[PDB]
Each structure stands twice: as C-alpha cells, then as structure tokens.
Design a protein around this ligand. Sequence first.
Ligand SMILES: CCCOP(=O)(O)OC[C@H]1O[C@@H](n2cnc3c(N)ncnc32)[C@H](O)[C@@H]1O
Ligand SMILES: CCCOP(=O)(O)OC[C@H]1O[C@@H](n2cnc3c(N)ncnc32)[C@H](O)[C@@H]1O
Ligand SMILES: CCCOP(=O)(O)OC[C@H]1O[C@@H](n2cnc3c(N)ncnc32)[C@H](O)[C@@H]1O
Ligand code: NA
Lengths: 654, 654, 654
Amino acid sequence: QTHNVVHEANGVKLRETPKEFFERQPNKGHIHDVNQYKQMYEQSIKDPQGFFGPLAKELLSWDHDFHTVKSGTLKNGDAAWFLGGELNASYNCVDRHAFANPDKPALICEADDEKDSHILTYGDLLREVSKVAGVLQSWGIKKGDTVAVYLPMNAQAIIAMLAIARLGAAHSVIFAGFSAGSIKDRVNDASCKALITCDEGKRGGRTTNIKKLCDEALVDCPTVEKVLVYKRTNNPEIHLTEGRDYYWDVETAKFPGYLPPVSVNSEDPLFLLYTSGSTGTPKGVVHSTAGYLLGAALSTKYIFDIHPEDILFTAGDVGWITGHTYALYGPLLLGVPTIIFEGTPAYPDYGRFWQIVEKHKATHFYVAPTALRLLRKAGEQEIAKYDLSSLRTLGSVGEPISPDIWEWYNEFVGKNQCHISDTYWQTESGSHLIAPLAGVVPNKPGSASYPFFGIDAALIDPVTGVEIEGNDAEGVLAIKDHWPSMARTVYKNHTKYMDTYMNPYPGYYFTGDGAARDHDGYYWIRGRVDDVVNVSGHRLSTAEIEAALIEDKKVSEAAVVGIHDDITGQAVIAYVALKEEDSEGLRKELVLQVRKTIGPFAAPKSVIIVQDLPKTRSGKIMRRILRKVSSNEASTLSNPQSVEGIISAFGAQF
Amino acid sequence: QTHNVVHEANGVKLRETPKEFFERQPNKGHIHDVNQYKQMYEQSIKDPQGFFGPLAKELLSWDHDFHTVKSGTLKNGDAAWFLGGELNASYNCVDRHAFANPDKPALICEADDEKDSHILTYGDLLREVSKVAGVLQSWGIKKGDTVAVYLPMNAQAIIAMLAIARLGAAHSVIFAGFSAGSIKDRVNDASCKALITCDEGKRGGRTTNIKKLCDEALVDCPTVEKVLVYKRTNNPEIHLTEGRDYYWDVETAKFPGYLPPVSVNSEDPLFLLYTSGSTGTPKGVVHSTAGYLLGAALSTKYIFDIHPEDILFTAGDVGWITGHTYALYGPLLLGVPTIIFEGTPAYPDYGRFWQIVEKHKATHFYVAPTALRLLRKAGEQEIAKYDLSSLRTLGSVGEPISPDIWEWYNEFVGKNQCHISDTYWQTESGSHLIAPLAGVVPNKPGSASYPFFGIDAALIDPVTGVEIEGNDAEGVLAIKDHWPSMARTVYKNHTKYMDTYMNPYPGYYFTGDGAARDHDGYYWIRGRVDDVVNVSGHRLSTAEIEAALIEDKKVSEAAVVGIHDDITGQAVIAYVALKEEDSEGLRKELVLQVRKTIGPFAAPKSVIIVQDLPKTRSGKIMRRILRKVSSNEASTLSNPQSVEGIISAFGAQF
Amino acid sequence: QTHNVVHEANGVKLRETPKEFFERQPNKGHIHDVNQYKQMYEQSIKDPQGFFGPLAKELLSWDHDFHTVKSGTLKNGDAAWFLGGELNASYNCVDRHAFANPDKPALICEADDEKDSHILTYGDLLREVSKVAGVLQSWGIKKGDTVAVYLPMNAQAIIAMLAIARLGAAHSVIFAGFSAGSIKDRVNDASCKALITCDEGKRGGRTTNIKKLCDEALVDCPTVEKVLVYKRTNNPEIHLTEGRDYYWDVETAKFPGYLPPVSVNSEDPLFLLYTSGSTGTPKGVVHSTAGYLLGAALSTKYIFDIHPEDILFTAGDVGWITGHTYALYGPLLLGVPTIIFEGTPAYPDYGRFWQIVEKHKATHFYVAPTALRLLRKAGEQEIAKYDLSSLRTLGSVGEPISPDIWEWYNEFVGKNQCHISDTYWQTESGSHLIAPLAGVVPNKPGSASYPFFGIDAALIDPVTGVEIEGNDAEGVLAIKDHWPSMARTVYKNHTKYMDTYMNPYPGYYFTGDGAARDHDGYYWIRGRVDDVVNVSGHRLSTAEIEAALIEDKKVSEAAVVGIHDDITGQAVIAYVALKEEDSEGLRKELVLQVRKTIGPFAAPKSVIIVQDLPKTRSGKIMRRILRKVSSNEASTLSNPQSVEGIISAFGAQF
Ligand SMILES: CCCOP(=O)(O)OC[C@H]1O[C@@H](n2cnc3c(N)ncnc32)[C@H](O)[C@@H]1O
Ligand SMILES: CCCOP(=O)(O)OC[C@H]1O[C@@H](n2cnc3c(N)ncnc32)[C@H](O)[C@@H]1O
Ligand SMILES: CCCOP(=O)(O)OC[C@H]1O[C@@H](n2cnc3c(N)ncnc32)[C@H](O)[C@@H]1O
Ligand code: NA
C-alpha cells in the first residue's frame, strides 16, 4: 500500500462490476470468479501448449489439424502457432455460420445517412463474398498475392477483405484518409496485383474524393493489373481507365453465389497493415492466419463477454487495427452481428452513436477516448433521450483514458450499470494485451488492469536493461514470450522487424510504451517512449512529418514534437528553419505539403519559424526544449540565445 | 381413372417388367420392390441430407471428407453439394479400379472399321491418361484452366477429358460436327489455353476434315498456347503450325505411365458444355465435380441396374451431355466397361449396332429415338441375325418416344424380355430426372414414369404462375429444389443463368418443357415450350439459325420454326424475306451460310421466300402462322393478304 | 563348395562381425540374428505391401496418408509407391526434429580450413532453410519448378536443396567440377527458373572459380530469371549481373525464420540428377519424394546401424548420388548429425579425415575405395595418431573394393573392431541394393553380401536372355521388381528411360553391371558391361569423351577405353585419328578440349595418335583391341597392319 513510484495508484479504489450487468447477461458468464481467471491466466503462461490447444480446436474450424501448438523464440524471431494446421478465415467468419443460421444478421451497415443503411445476413454475406471472390479469381488472384483496399468504413470494405482472404490472398487495407503518395508507397511495397476502391465516399454530409486519389497513385504503381470500383454515389463523371478499372456491380453479377474457400497454412499471411514507427518509412506489419483469428476470438469472447445473443458496435475504422480485429474478425468468428458505421458521431446530431445503440439494441460498445471528449464538450445532453439500456459492456481503445473521462463514461452512458474495459494493445499485438475482463475484474479508473491470456507482462529499466521485480515500479513495458496473434514480420524486411521489436531487449518483445505496476497488480500505461505521438488515435512518427516539411526547397531543417491538446489528445507542433516574406502564408503552404505527402490528419496545429534550432554540439536537435517551450519554460546546448528566439516566435505564432 | 386432361394416359396399361430380365441379373437387384423405391424416393425429397450423405461416401472415393451435404437455394442460385469435400474425377473413374483389377476392360473402342477397333484395360487407361495429363502439365495446364476438345466419339476423346480433369482443369468438349465459327466463339468464351484434336476423322467410310477446321478458328483464338494432335489417319499432308501444334504420340511417349491426381473441391468446375437456349448466343453450362459424378453414379447404378459384371453400350456422342454422363463418367465411376462407337448405325451394314452387342455380349444398350426410326425403315431385318441375348436393359434418350416405337423396341430388339427405360433429362440436369428404374417400375409406353432420387417434380400453370396440384393435369414442368448434378452457373455469366432457370418461376428450376401427370403418377413429356427445336437430338435455338441467315446482305428478315419430320423427328423450315434472280440458287446459298456459321445439322430442310412476313402491329413475326402453314391451314395481323402469299410460296418451294 | 564359375569365392572365409562393435552400440541392435534378417528380407519380396506399409508410417511423418503401397510394373514403367500420400522432405529432414530437440547438432560443417568450420543445430537449420526458401518463394518458385544448384560440398548446398524441396520444387545439383558447357546443357534441359551458387570455392588451399563459370553458361540459359550467390570468400571483384544475381546474405535477412512447408504428393518429383549412360547425352534421373526418402531411411538405419545417439561422416560430394542419400537425406530423416567436408583428405595433412572422426567422435564413416588407395600410398602412418575409437561402422561405395584394400581397411582404421559394409548401388537405385548389414551379416572381403529389403536380385545370361538359377553362376545383374527408391523416369524423356532400364530385359530392371553369386548367396560385382568407365568414382560414358575430342576440326575419328590405374581405379585412354606438326602439343590441346566440354575429371591420361583405327568391315571400331593394346597384346579386321601401328604409337606416347 501507500504507493510511492506509482502516483496514479494512490487514492484509487476498486470500482466493482455493477450488479445489473450480470442480470443482463443472456447466459451464464464465461468465467465465474476472479480466482478462476487467475488460474486460467497462470496456465496460459506456464503451459501454453495445454492452454491454447483446446481453445484453438473449440473456437476455430480447421480444414486440417495442427501438430504443434507453439514454436520459435522472440530472440530468433521465428515464432509460430498451430504449425501444420490448415484453415480459412472466410469459412470461420462467414461460411460456417451461414450454414447454421442463414437469416441471422451479420453486417448491420449504418451509412452516413440512415436512408442508405441496410443489413446483410450471414447467408447474404456468404453470397456477396463468394461473388467478389469470384471476380478476383478470374482476374488471377491466387494464394500469396496481396490485394489493396482503399474503402471507407462500410460493408463493402468488410466484404472485400473476406473475399481476398477467401482465395488465400492477403489484403492490405489503406486508410481512406491517406493521400495519393501514401497509397503509392504502400502499394509498391506490397506489389499488389489488384485494388478494390469506390467512386467516392460520403462522410459527415460531405462528398470525399476516393477514386480520383487512386488514379493519381496508380500511374506510379505498375503491379496493379485490375481495379474494382463500387458505386457508392454513382457519380456519372467518374473516369474509369479501360483495361484497368472495372465495376463492382457489373462483375459480381457474373459469378455464382458460392465459391469454394482455399485452405491456407496456419502461418500463411492473412493481411498486411502499414504503421509508422519512430525510425524509418511506414512498415508493412504481417499477421498469420490462425494465431490472429484465435487471438481475436479469445479477446472478444472473454474480455467483452460476447455471447451468441449479443450485438457489438465498434466505432473504429477498418483502416486501422481496431476495425480489423473488433469490427470484423472478432465478432464474425463468434457468429454475432457487428455494426459498421460509415459516418461521424456528430452528423446528423451528436446523438447518432446512441440512436444506433437504441435502434439495433446493441449490447457491447467500443469507442476511443478521443470521441468521448468530443461528445462531452459538444453533445452531452443527447445521451438521455435514447434508451441505451441494452448495453452491457463499454470499451475504450487507442488513447490513455483519464479518470475524469472514466467516471463520465460510467454514469452518463452506462448509468453505473455497464462494465468499462480499457483495452490496451497495439497494431503488432493483433489482440488485446491488457484489459479488464467484464464480469470478472474490478477496474481501476485509468488502469488497464491485468494482462490477458498468453501475455507474460514485465517491466524493464531503460538504462540498465534489467527486468524490474516487485510492485510500485515503473519502466519500459515488454512481454517475455510471444503469443498467437503476435505479428510475425515486416513485409520483405525482417531485419527491421528484429531491430524494432526483438533486438532492443533480447528475449523480450518491445512495446514502445512506458508503464507502471501497483501493489494490486493493475497496470498503468504512461505513453510511448519513442518518437511517436498519438494524434486522435493515429500513431504518427515525428520523422515522417519532418521529412514531409523538408521537401519544400526553402526548409533547411525541421523538428516536430507533441503536446496535450484537449480535443485531439496530442497535437504535433512544427518548428521549422528556412534557408533565406509572407511568413504566415508559407506556414500554411507547409501544412498542405504535409497533407499531400501523408494526409490531412498529420497537419500540424501550428508552425513556428526560427532561424536556429536548439542543438547539441554533435548536432542533435534538443527535442526536450521544443517540447517544454510549447507548455512551460522552467543541460549543454550550442547557443542559448536561440532558446529566447524560439520562445519569442512561439508566442508570436501559436 | 378416365383421364380427361392427359389424353395420352387413356387406353394405356402397365407393361410389366419381363420375367426373363430378373433371371439374367448377374446378382440380386439393387431394389427389391416398387414400394421400396417409393420409400427411397420419399426420403431423398424430405431428408436430402440423410439420403445422399451415405450414397456419396459409398459410391465416391474422397481425398477429403465434406462437412455439409446441401447448401444454397434455387431462388438465390447458390446451390452446392458436399461442401468441404475434396476428390478427383480421374481417380474415381480410372485409378481406383485399375488398382483392384488392372486387366479388366475399361474402354471397348469400336471404330468406323472393326479392323481399327481395340480394347483398353483400366491399367492401360491409367497409363494413357497419366501420359496425356503429363503433357498438359508440362505445357502449364493447372487447376482452374479450361482445355478445349475437338475430337470424334472414340477412345482418344475419353482419354482427353480424363487427363484434363486429372490436373483439376475443366474440359470443354466441342462437337466435331460444329463449324469453325462455332469453335471460335466457344474457345474465346472459355479462354482455353490448350486444344486437343486429331488430324482428321473417319465416319461412315468418309474422311472428315478436323484439324483444318481448328486451324481456321485458331487464328482468331489468342488464348490457345499449344495444341495436341492425334494421328487418327496419319495423313502426311496435314500442316502443323510450329510452336503451337504438337503430336499426341510424340509427346505422350516422353512422360511416365503414372501421374499423381490433383485434388479439387467438390464445387470446383468439372467441365463446360455449350448449349443454345431460346434467347441469346450459346451459353457455357458449368457442372461441379462432386455433385455431378454422384448423380451419374446413382442414375447408372439404379435406373439401368448396372452391376460389376455388366457391360454398357451408349450410342451418343461425347460432344453432347449424353456421351458425357452415360458413355464416360457413369460407367467408369462404377468400374464397368463402356463401349465407344466412332461410326454410324448404317455403315457397314444396318446391323452394326447389333454386331457390337453380340460381339462384346453387352448387357445394357442406350439409344436415341431418332436412330430407332432410321433402323426400322431401313434395316429392320438384320436384327434377327445377331444374338442380342445378353441385353437386359434398353434405354431411350433425347427425343419423345412414340408408343409405336416403344412396342417395336420391346419385341424386335428386346424380344419382350428387356426392360425399356425412357430417360428424360437435360444438359443442365446432368443426370436422369425421370425414368423407369429397371426391375422396379412398370413402364407406360411413351411415359418416362416417376422422377428420380432427389428430384421433386411439379407442374406450373403458364399464365397464373401457380403450382398445379392433383392428377389429370398439364402445364410447365419445374423442379422444386436443386439436386447434386444440377448445373451451377453459366461460365462468366451467372445473370443469364438466373434469368433462364431461376427467375422465370422463383423457387423453382425451369426446365423449358411441357408435361402432364396422370392418376398413376406417371409423367408424360409434351415437348419444349420455348423457341428450341430438337432436330435429330441436337437442341437448336431458332434465333441462332435466324441470325445466320441474316448475315447475307440480301436478307432483310427471317423466321424459322419446326414441324414433324419422320426421320429427323423435327425439322426447321426457313421463311426469309429479301431486300430487293436465281431464286432456287440463293436458297441453296443460304443453306451453306447456316452450315458455315453453325454446322451441317442446322441447315433447314427448305427455304421459302416471301416478300412480307406475318406480323403483329408492334412487329412480332407470327410464328404460329408459319408453323401451321407448313402443315395444315385451318387473331389480328397487319396484312392478311401476306398469308395467302406465304401459302403460295410454301407449295412452290417445299 | 569348391566354386568353379565364381573364382573369387574360392579361398574366402567369413570374417565374423567383431565383438567390440556390439558393445559400442549405444542401444540394442535393430536386428538380433542373421536369421531374423532373412525372414525380414523374405517378407519384403513376397509381401511388399505388408512389409513397407508399417515402415513408411514409422519412419516418415505424413501430411496425408496413402491408400496403396505399391502400383505399376517394370515392363510398363509405371512404378509408384505410397500412392495418395502427401508429405514434405524438409519437414521430415528438419522441422520435426527441430521441434523435439532444437539445440541438437544437425550439420557439422567442416570447411577446407578448420578455422572456417561451424555447427548448425536443427533449430538453426530450420531457420536458415526457411529464410532461403522464403527468398525463392518471393522470386516465384512454386511446386513443379526446377531449381539448379552449383555449390561445393558445404553446409550452404545442404541448406539449398532443403529450401527448394520445402517449396515443393525439385533441385538439380550440378557438380562443381563440371564445366560451363555441362551446366548449360543441364540447366536448359530442366528449364530451371533459378540458380543457387557461390562467388568462388576453396578446396585444398586453392581458390576455385565458380560464379564466373555460371555467368558463362547463363548467357545461353534464358529460363533462369534470378540467381542466389553466397559469399564464401567475399571476393570484392566478383561481378553480379543486375536484375539476375542477388546475394544470399542480403536476401535471407529479409525473410522470417519460419516458412510453412508445402505438401507434395508421394510420386511428385523430389530432385533431378544428371548421369551419363553408354549411349546418348547425359540424362536427367528423376526420383519421387516418398519412395526415395523411405529407401534412404531404411538403408541408413539398418545397413549402417544408425541410432539416435550416432554421428555419421560421409566423404562423398553432394554433386553425386552418394552425397544426396547418405550425406543429407538418410541422416537427417533419422534425426542424427551429419558431417559435411568441403576439403580433400590430403589438405592440410593426410590425417584430415581422421582428425574429424576424432574431433566430433564420429561413429560411422563412409568412404570410396579410391580414397583408401590414396591414403595407403601417401599417408598411412597418420592414422595411428588420432583416436578413431568412436567408429563402429566403416563403409565402402562407388568402386570395386579389393580384398587387399578390405584387410587394410579392417585393421589399419577399424583396428579389427569396426564392421565393414561394401555398399553397391546406383544413381538410379537411390538407396543401397546389396550391402552387409552391420551386426548381422559376416562380410566376405570383396563381396557386397546379400541384397537389401525389397530388392529381388537375379542374374541373366547375356546371350540367351534367360534368368540363371543356382549358385556358382555369373551373368548380367538385374532386379525382378521395382522398389520404393527406384528412379521413376528421365526428365521429359521417358522413352530413353524405358530403352535403357526396362526394355533390354523385359520384366527386369537392367543395372548395367556384371555379377556372380556363390553357394553362400553372397554377390560379387564384376564391373559394368556397357561403355561406362568408373574413373575416381565418376561414371563417364566413352561416347561423351569421344564427342568432345571430335569437336576439334582436325579429329577425323576417336575411340576411348579404360584400363586399371592404381590411383584412379580406371583411366580413360584416347586413340584419335587426325585428318591431315607439334604432335605432342596437339595431344595437350585435345586434353583441355575435353576439360572444356565436360570437365577436368574426364581428361584422358594419354592420347595416342594413329592414322587408321582397328575396324570391322561394317565400320565398328574394335574397342577390344585398343583395350588389350594398353595392357597386354596376346577375329576378323579390315587391316591388321594398323594394329602394329597402334602398338608402335602407344609405346611412343604412353
Ligand atoms: C490498438 C489501437 C491502435 O493501435 P496503434 O498501433 O495505432 O497504437 C498503439 C499505441 O496506442 C496506445 N494505446 C492503445 N491502446 C491504449 C490504451 N487502452 N491506453 C493507453 N494507450 C493505449 C499505446 O501507446 C500503444 O502502443
Ligand atoms: C439429355 C439429352 C440431350 O439433352 P439436351 O440438353 O440436348 O436437350 C434436352 C431436351 O430434350 C428433350 N428430351 C430429352 N430426353 C427426353 C425424353 N426421354 N423424352 C422426351 N423429351 C426428351 C426435352 O425437350 C429436354 O428439355
Ligand atoms: C552409388 C555410387 C555412385 O553411383 P554411380 O551411379 O555414379 O555409379 C554406379 C556404378 O558404380 C559401380 N559401383 C557402385 N558401388 C559399387 C560397389 N560397392 N562395388 C562395386 N561397384 C560399385 C557399379 O558399376 C555401379 O553400376
Ligand atoms: Na490438402
């Protein structure tokens, strides 16, 4: 007790799981007592073979059984799960459920306008996936090909990824916010032979350009042989390059309503998803087929307490890992309907999220902390109008949750009845690492609680590189052994995959996050230790933004850091130095330069112009100074007078 | 009793199964009583899962077992059988039998001249198929490729289709009668990467040109990379385009006598077979692998009463669905020798069919009604010379059988000892739909008796579109649910497949045939309701013939209909109107224009030339008038005087 | 007794298996008594299905089980084993052992210099094979592709063949001694899409050129898309053609440490290996996957008495069948470490072979008789310095072993404690045919003893073509039925495969060797009957050397034969006749002409020049005369005076 190192633990008492939730369970809970979970967790770490074997056979339908549950080491980067097994993601997500209950809802597609909303049953999802998959096969997509997807968060993207996996190909979903240059690089890296996109998207009542950005990047993408285009708005003046572009509706009507699924090996690539790390250009994270689906199945069934009668709503976009796991695979593997929203929580009214939960009587809701802050400041009153009584579990993902936000979440939406589960994980983790299991774990506000099955959490001292033992401790967060849903490599570049995750601390998986552990065992996440800032959930490497600013001929050097913006969580500020008029206009010109190389979400909130940057004698720009200058101004540098200049221009600009 | 609507049922008494047949059975009959069959049939309709499951495991050797017997609906066009199963057609047709009895006869190849006849054992068929398959594999044929076959009805074609299926490819047999333009269209549609043909064919003592027609179409077929040519006559002056054409004997000698078969999914395409429907160009009918072979195995074993000691003779050509199912797959699946005839029933003498039955002591004989009429008028006396005592079952296929022909069949050939089984089915049906089961069902002459296992027959009123209930009823014939051997789609054009079979009467499979059902339950087929005429067994769309006539610049409009010709069953007459001398010569010039675009069997018997066609005010040519004018002349038209002109020119011409 | 025909059997007594060996067995011997072996052998011949079935399931890990143990006949050339089975060679050789004992040694790589020696564990071999296999897959290598290997006898070649088989591709190892023209022909025949080689090799302290010879042949090899180059010496001035050549270290670092193995059918090609027969250019011998690995597993486990605790040293190069079977697959299948030597038994000292046996405490040693003669004449004394006490079994392979050499082997190296096993077999045989089983069979010096499991040995009279029955008999050696590891065909040329092995004596496998059988049943090999001479183990067709000499414009005709050279066993002499000065220099010019078309090992020891060759009236060069002229001069020819000229020039030259 009386924590000294973990200051956040002090003054925090366990918020017991509300009693109303256990009554709203449609069936007996998967786990009875919290002591039962600790016994399950202890087995997954000590005996991984005896723990995950049965669960894999229970939750996955195998075309061919595996001979070995776990192989490989973190140090050697040769991890593998369920070796010898053969299965298919589209059979487990669609086919098997469509045979039992064809008319059961599968995709509840809620569009930007509710007039364009519709529901697809599992029988319908099987027919549409088979048809789309039939088109890609006639085009020549085979096992081992990568197929790119540039679609908004609607049912069409869900259908696309399943049809690609159905053939044994790997899908690479590119976020619709990205620019043309970001599509160019990502496609060329994967050597995609096909692209699935739409004519244009509609979000918040505005018509976003989609196909036009694809045509721009595709002139520099020679691997793409053919492109599939969906008529989301049916705009007549949308050009389609002959021989390359073909129409979704026209081609799918040519092929039958059932296509045989292609068996893939357990360690065969399921998908690629590009993320930006502290150093280097965005890398292509690869996930295996079997170990990923299992991880998604476990975390969904047990942490969220998902039963066959439940309905899940996950707000995240499929362009990021959250939509991948807990808007598609997780729910569909368990045979429950998932809610896919193509709009924003503000259009038409700020209660749009809550109409959907009322309309479809959703039982589980998954949201990012950046959206809860937006709703509180803007549309807090609308919540009471809608029912929201069907919700049993409220989740949080992507950003640190504040105790202030946690209490607002519990009563304003859950009415002190729902269970709150702060789910900490990563794109590379595939599934949840640390989260409160609903009905089991009493959550401490702000803490992600205990680690999940198969995750052996530990802290490491950053300087000495030793594992810290005990409680009331702080350090770098790392995992001792690999787990089923762990990412297996970076596409065509395993060396950077080792240099990033396995080599910083050999024998450990490097998460890039600082954490603390209290005496109760609950884990507190303190943010990323490398040069990555979480801006509205999007991870952004400072180096990617800095390289975009330097593309302008005038920019001699640039440096970007992050600070706490209330709405966005973190915002990147740009301190740029020019070589040798209209200073305010050039600042805006740099903002679109970042918006052109990367996308609109990378644009800095402000750009401060200084002649000299705070540098050490060797040359390293003192990012610690620029960080504090943004907030509070209170070591050895080259010129200290330059610091007064940076403070002068910061107030002048921001 | 006392049928009013079904006039054919009146005056017809059951012709009981002859007692001599049961004694000639080499073993106990598959079905004991007719009540046993009705119980089997009732199960196949009520419980399809419990009926076809065991039969599939019994009659098919699976590389991998299936998880679901039946999926999909007619309304959605997503039918599938034995989902998850893996198997290969060449293993079930050749390999497994060759292991048990290598020296057992498999292909009894009876050529145009008996001096060129030979027998291939199952061990020989395994070696020749493996070698041919070895050539196609080195050429690059893989699972999912289509391979065209343009061969006469000999052992080489049988070997070809097995070698193609062995690799998992799909074979498209093109009838040797077709012209070059028909090969052109069919090949381009399937995008065949290879072609198997012969130098030239010999039929009825005449040397038919084969390779030369292939070279003509192949200049407009870019997908064909290589061609395999068999030396049927070894004509020295047969050109072989270098890089494309290679020799059957030369290449097969390069590869070993065993090649591993490639596993295909149950719903993977087995073959394509092009047929002409009332509307549109000829379409590519697709059949699955597993559901087709089962249907062929069931219909052969039970309707024909085929036992391991039996020998089957089916006269049909492999260019049509009859040779596909009951000259190749059906017999070979059950491990019995099949008789392949490359000649005609007239050369050398009209008793050639009966020498073969005597020579090889055939037990089952399958023939079309168009051949029975030819033999009766020309060579009726030769039958008594040959033994023909080994025959147990006589079959009829393709055309309506007349009660006059049925009685001639029973005594002149069967000697009132064989069982006659009128087998009604379709290219799309894959296997028999309605037929008398030998040893079980007493056949009514002219009636195809009761429907077969898994076929839920029903009649629909054409106008109201309602299912007719009761007996003494007539209407459109339709099947309530799909069946294993049902065709799954039209190649690369599922929309026309729905528009033709599933959309005319939703929830039903449209057969395109009129039928009647008497009080005993026996079904009577009354012919096709759409614009298709059965000329000597070949289904011919009127629109395909009309489009060929219109290719001549002079032809303004044309219209073709059918009437009863004794020899051909039905003959198509052509009424053509020219724009603006040698009228008799231009009539002959049009006949070869049809023979050039389609083939020799489409040529009209006569061509009547009129200036105006009987038309409604909207423009539809009154095909009912041209139909009656051909036979007996006894509504609102545009000009009635034109009718007197059509009658005047009909007598003048025909 | 008192053998008359088998003169070698007379005066020979059984040398009983030394008692010390049974004590040095780490476990109970696989076979207890010699009578037990005869009962096992009798079953393998009478009931092949009941004998090899269990052994295949015991010694091989199957991805899918087979349905038939044995099919096909020698006469039809359609042999097949374990039909229907699916497996992978790299799983059985690496993966399965790496799971049980990752840190167990697998490849003990002893380089030309011991400073460059290293050991790879089974876990390491799994990671390196997976990475290399990962590179070939991204390059596009798939099941059915051939990949060429031009590497010396080191660990890199072993890794290469496993990675190729891992993908289901077939590897074609080309011996590093061969010239550029020999690589050209071999690659073009197989149509290899990739090549794995190294910058240069080091052997006996000399730097051999390797990559440079590849670049020379690759300009005439269009099928090769990409090439993998290993940095054996890291010579900076090694050119790498851009787009074609890539670096082993650079590419393998890009791919992960585990790659899923690809299932292949039992009869799918494992590898190709080119050998030269009496007639024709070198042919590509093909071996199946399953039947080969089993044969290698049986012969290694039982003839050599290999147990899990044993260590094997086989001196042969992987460029020939010996390194294939008993330096790679045989040991690795059984999960024991194998010793790979990149040097020669003379460098640094003649006791290098024996340091390795002492260093790694090797228990089994495999050597060719040509090396035992070299060591005896040059470095006999070094043997006593090293321990060599861990050896239990000494083997002999490739050449006839002399009784003089057999006794030297037994005491000078084995110290009358090891068991000597003369293993006679062929490239086409895949595994041992006739050999003494250690611990079971008392070996007669010079005799290979009894045939092995599944080999039904018999002798045939060369003239009459009848099988000789009884003992004290001599004739052509042939095998009555095929066996699992028998070669299945010649690549893309099955006709020559039949003409060579199955057609000379139908119903028998032609070995090309003369043999004798004594009253005890022991077999004595008397050499090859066709025009093939074993020069230092390399089989060399006389026709291949003769064609190389004739390439020079001056050479009108040439004829080469073989005689007994002490060091090389057999040496080829060249008698060449020119069309029309510096006679000694042209003789040397011809020697390099052979060294350029074939390789350095084909160069004749001497070249005798004569104007006329001893010829029959039809024209056949009397090779019997040139054979005797070389040794002792003691029929009807065209000119007898030419014989005096050949004798005159032989003494003048050689
Ligand atoms: C999985 C969401 C999308 O993942 P990304 O790969 O884009 O970003 C992962 C990072 O988000 C933060 N993070 C994620 N979840 C939480 C969380 N629940 N609490 C605090 N920080 C969190 C942690 O810093 C982590 O390293
Ligand atoms: C299966 C033979 C070749 O089939 P096709 O696809 O070429 O033609 C099918 C049509 O032939 C007629 N037909 C077929 N068999 C009979 C039959 N036994 N009696 C009467 N009409 C028949 C029916 O009209 C049917 O729609
Ligand atoms: C397997 C070694 C490499 O094989 P190759 O395919 O290069 O050569 C096979 C031939 O070598 C001889 N031969 C092989 N082993 C022996 C042996 N043990 N004794 C005598 N001659 C032998 C026999 O003549 C045989 O036909
Ligand atoms: Na399989």
